[PDB]
Design a protein around this ligand. Structure first.
Ligand code: HEM
Ligand SMILES: [Ca+2]
Ligand SMILES: [Ca+2]
Ligand SMILES: [Zn+2]
Ligand SMILES: [Zn+2]
Ligand SMILES: [Zn+2]
Length: 318
């Protein structure tokens, strides 16, 4: 189909998204960059969607975190989500899209700005949310592997899918874990969707980048990077370590698995058969820049190998 402005899409119902795309690329993502607001919007997709429990309730990827912001933005795990919720709200108000659709659309558009990134499948038509998420459904960095895997499993994700989703931490920073060093990334390339996160989390810790006693934080290998306890554990625990290492220098796998698992996440609480496929509105991401490496000065002996079956691959240092 051909939209009013000449841009094309497989389904004409998707044409409504083109002005939304343009508006967010300029006014949410600073001119289509893979920066702060992309990182925050990607986190928001998860905090919206993971509010889904057969036992406890919540409608998943339903926009509840916006619609019921007064409740959800006060949950402790939603610390520091409230800025991006406030930023997204006016776009929802001005564009006649449900909040659930908008959150997933913005997340997919944002990821597509990141070199190495993917075009996450995007479906249009989620109804407005009808309940707030319960509290305590978002994993915390001080939660154990067993707790995290049980929570994610409750929502429908296998252990390997949790690892795949954590490729998000390749384009990510922390503002609240250590509030003395806001904006500190989880890998050395927070503007590049790459395997550096899976490499750098496997390194021996060396230092605390800010203060030395924050809940849910462990030592980082690098000044200017922060390491979550949860990521530290997931990289090393026997239940997940082999899958974690399999992501290292495996860009095609990171791409394929992140896109597919994000689509699953974006559809929690929804039925794809009642939605319209608008995947081709999402921009084409740039190719990866750079290549998997150890940080400058590091060597393979700095890697804490945790997969008994398969040795860590022989990366070189910058
Ligand atoms: C599996 C358990 C997970 C835990 C324990 C966890 C924990 C965290 C924490 C503590 C932060 C930093 C918040 C702050 O202090 O500002 C963070 C940031 C982030 N998380 Fe995760 N996360 C998990 C899974 C995910 C998943 C599945 C996604 C997928 C979308 C995701 C995407 C992000 C992104 C993109 C950021 C960066 C936000 C920014 O730059 O402000 N996380 N996460
Ligand atoms: Ca929700
Ligand atoms: Ca990265
Ligand atoms: Zn900005
Ligand atoms: Zn911010
Ligand atoms: Zn374990």
């Amino acid at each position: 189909a051909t939209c009013a402005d000449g841009r094309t899409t497989a389904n004409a119902a998707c044409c409504v998204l083109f002005p939304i795309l343009d508006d967010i690329q300029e006014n949410l993502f600073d001119g289509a960059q893979c920066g702060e607001e992309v990182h925050e919007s990607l986190r928001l997709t998860f905090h919206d969607a993971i509010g889904f429990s057969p036992t406890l309730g919540g409608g998943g990827a339903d926009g509840s975190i916006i619609t019921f912001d007064t409740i959800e933005t006060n949950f402790p795990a939603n610390a520091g989500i409230d800025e991006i919720v406030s930023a997204q709200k006016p776009f929802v108000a001005k564009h006649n899209i449900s909040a659930g659709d908008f959150i997933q659309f913005a997340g997919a558009v944002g990821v597509s700005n990141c070199p190495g990134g993917v075009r996450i499948p995007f479906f249009l038509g989620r109804p407005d949310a009808v309940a707030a998420s319960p509290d305590h459904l978002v994993p915390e960095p001080f939660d154990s592997v067993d707790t995290i895997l049980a929570r994610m499993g409750d929502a429908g994700f296998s252990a390997v899918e949790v690892v795949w989703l954590l490729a998000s931490h390749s384009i990510a920073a922390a503002d609240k874990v250590d509030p003395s060093i806001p904006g500190t990334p989880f890998d050395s390339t927070p503007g590049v969707f790459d395997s550096q996160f899976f490499i750098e989390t496997q390194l021996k810790g060396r230092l605390f980048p800010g203060t030395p006693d924050n809940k849910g934080e462990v030592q980082s290998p690098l000044q200017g990077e922060i390491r979550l306890q949860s990521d530290h554990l997931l990289a090393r625990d026997p239940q997940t370590a082999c899958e974690w290492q399999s992501m290292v220098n495996n860009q095609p796998k990171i791409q394929n698995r992140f896109a597919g698992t994000m689509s699953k996440m974006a559809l929690l609480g929804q039925d794809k058969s009642k939605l319209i496929d608008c995947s081709d509105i999402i921009p084409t991401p740039p190719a990866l820049v750079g290549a998997a490496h150890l940080p400058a000065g590091f060597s393979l002996s700095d890697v804490e190998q945790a997969c008994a079956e398969t040795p860590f691959p022989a990366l070189t240092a910058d």
